[PDB]
Amino acid sequence: MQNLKADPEELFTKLEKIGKGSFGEVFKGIDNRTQKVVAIKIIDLEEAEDEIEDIQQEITVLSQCDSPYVTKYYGSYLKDTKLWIIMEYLGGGSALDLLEPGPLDETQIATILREILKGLDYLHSEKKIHRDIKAANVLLSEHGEVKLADFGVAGQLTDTQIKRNTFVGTPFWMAPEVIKQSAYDSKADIWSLGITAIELARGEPPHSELHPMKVLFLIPKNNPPTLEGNYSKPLKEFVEACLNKEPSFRPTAKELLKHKFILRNAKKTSYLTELIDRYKRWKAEQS
Numbered sequence: 460m461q462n463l464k465a466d467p468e469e470l471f472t473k474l475e476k477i478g479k480g481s482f483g484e485v486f487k488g489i490d491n492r493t494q495k496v497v498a499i500k501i502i503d504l505e506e507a508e509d510e511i512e513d514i515q516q517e518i519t520v521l522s523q524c525d526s527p528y529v530t531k532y533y534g535s536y537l538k539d540t541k542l543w544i545i546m547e548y549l550g551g552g553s554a555l556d557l558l559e560p561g562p563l564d565e566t567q568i569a570t571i572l573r574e575i576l577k578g579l580d581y582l583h584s585e586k587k588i589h590r591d592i593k594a595a596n597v598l599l600s601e602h603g604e605v606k607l608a609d610f611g612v613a614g615q616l617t618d619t620q621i622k623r624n625t626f627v628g629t630p631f632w633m634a635p636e637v638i639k640q641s642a643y644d645s646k647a648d649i650w651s652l653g654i655t656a657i658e659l660a661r662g663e664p665p666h667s668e669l670h671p672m673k674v675l676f677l678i679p680k681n682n683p684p685t686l687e688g689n690y691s692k693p694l695k696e697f698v699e700a701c702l703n704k705e706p707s708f709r710p711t712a713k714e715l716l717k718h719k720f721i722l723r724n725a726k727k728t729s730y731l732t733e734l735i736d737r738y739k740r741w742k743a744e745q746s
């Protein structure tokens with residue numbers, strides 16, 4: 460890409476490993492001038508096979524986003540056979556990590572959903588579709604802020620290409636129209652958000668115990684998933700609104716920000732530090 464840079468160690472220092480994605484490794488790093496800690500995702504292009512398309516899309520999309528709800532991009536650097544993607548450091552854990560110690564309460568679910576919705580509204584307003592919304596791609600800072608991550612399969616709508624049709628995403632969270640490879644748009648992310656709402660409430664998405672290939676026919680054919688159990692009616696209705704088989708009947712992210720579930724339960728993001736501290740304790744006491 461046009462603004463690819465070189466000699467990253469002139470400006471940054473690579474520190475300890477903090478994550479592993481699908482293809483590359485993520486490290487903590489630090490800006491040598493401001494001493495601000497950052498995250499560095501390092502990709503070995505020599506290892507890169509047919510995932511290279513996704514690396515270029517990730518950098519392109521990150522570089523074009525400027526929102527408090529999307530991992531901030533600092534730049535991409537070439538270093539021998541590797542590519543360093545430098546981004547905002549988020550040290551609180553992903554929403555999936557934060558589910559490990561135990562269930563969330565409805566205030567936690569509504570607060571995390573509300574922040575994800577602000578990220579989706581930003582992306583959709585930029586004509587971008589994330590296409591891989593799930594708890595593992597929702598990252599929190601150590602202080603409770605919530606941001607969307609992992610843009611390798613994001614789609615871009617344009618003035619003439621008003622729909623996408625590529626089969627991409629993570630099966631359990633994929634909308635029926637994406638699985639069928641029908642023309643789709645940002646509403647596909649609203650279906651994935653409904654699945655993520657169930658994931659935040661139950662700890663796993665519907666069908667999580669089946670092989671993902673099986674869900675390729677269960678999803679289009681079956682009735683949409685619902686949330687059953689001791690959950691407030693508004694949370695079940697928030698899930699139902701998102702999980703409509705007809706995309707045009709799903710609400711937009713902006714409309715969902717005013718859903719009764721969000722309005723009556725979401726609280727300040729700073730309260731999420733209790734959840735972040737629970738994961739830290741949990742992880743330390745872990746056998």
Ligand SMILES: Nc1ncnc2c1ncn2[C@@H]1O[C@H](COP(=O)(O)OP(=O)(O)O)[C@@H](O)[C@H]1O
Nearest residue numbers: 478479480481482483485498546547548549609
């Ligand atoms: N900005 C970041 N700050 C802190 N940890 C991060 C950051 N980006 C990625 N990670 C760590 O890397 C993991 C996988 O990242 P992701 O973007 O989902 O990678 P991939 O495209 O290689 O699968 C995250 O789930 C997290 O544990």
Ligand SMILES: [Mn+2]
Nearest residue numbers: 480595596609
């Ligand atoms: Mn991911």
Ligand SMILES: [Mn+2]
Nearest residue numbers: 481609610611
């Ligand atoms: Mn990715």
